[PDB]
Amino acid sequence: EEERYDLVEGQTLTVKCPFNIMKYANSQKAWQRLPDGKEPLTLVVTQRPFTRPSEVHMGKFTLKHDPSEAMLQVQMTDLQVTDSGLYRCVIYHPPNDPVVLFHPVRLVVT
Ligand SMILES: [Zn+2]
Ligand SMILES: [Zn+2]
């Protein structure tokens, strides 16, 4: 179910994650990394009010919340080989289990 994204170091990863607006208009969203045998790492989250279009920066991560297109877009800039790993976009609502959007992204940076 994971999709491979093969990129060269220095490139920017862009991932478009649709979300169901009827269900998740007023929910927080997040980008997570999934290290093997560890808890998900939440890398960047949207901010309140959760229904509003937004763009948040957190280090090399950018999350664009585009409800007009029922879309969350994630960008990671200046990729390094050590960014290689499994990631996902989610509906974020702890302590409830995240709802996975789209499909997991297997990022391979060389
Ligand atoms: Zn929720
Ligand atoms: Zn290289």
How many angstroms does the Cα of residue 107 sit away from the middle of ligand 2?
Answer: 14
At position 65, the amino acid (one-letter code) is H
What ranges do the domains of the chain cover?
1-110
How many angstroms does the Cα of residue 16 sit away from the middle of ligand 1?
Answer: 20
Count the residues in the chain. 110
- DSSP letters, 7-46, are E-TT--EEEEEE--HHHHTTSEEEEEE--TTSPPEEEEE-
Structure tokens at 45: 């989250």
- CA torsion 95-97-102-108 (nearest 10°) is 90
Three-state DSSP at 67 gives: helix
- Tell me which residue of 35, 50, 22 sits closest to 88, measured CA to CA: 35
Euclidean distance between CA atoms 96 and 54, whole angstroms: 23
| CATH class entry, domain 1-110 | mainly beta
How many angstroms does the Cα of residue 80 sit away from the middle of ligand 2?
Answer: 8
Contact yes or no for 9/80 (Cβ under 8 A): yes
Technique that determined the structure: X-ray
Euclidean distance between CA atoms 64 and 94, whole angstroms: 21
Cβ neighbours for 48, distance < 8 A, ≥ 6 positions apart:
none
How many angstroms does the Cα of residue 37 sit away from the middle of ligand 1?
Answer: 25
Ligand nearest to the CA of 84: 2
For 93, other C-beta atoms within 10 Å of its C-beta total 14
Ligand nearest to the CA of 11: 2
ω before 95 within 30° of 0 (cis)? yes
Angle at 17 between CA 82 and CA 88, to 5 degrees: 40
Structure tokens at 88: 């996902």
Euclidean distance between CA atoms 105 and 2, whole angstroms: 6
Q: Kindly provide the resolution of this structure in angstroms, with one decimal.
A: 1.8
Contact yes or no for 54/62 (Cβ under 8 A): no
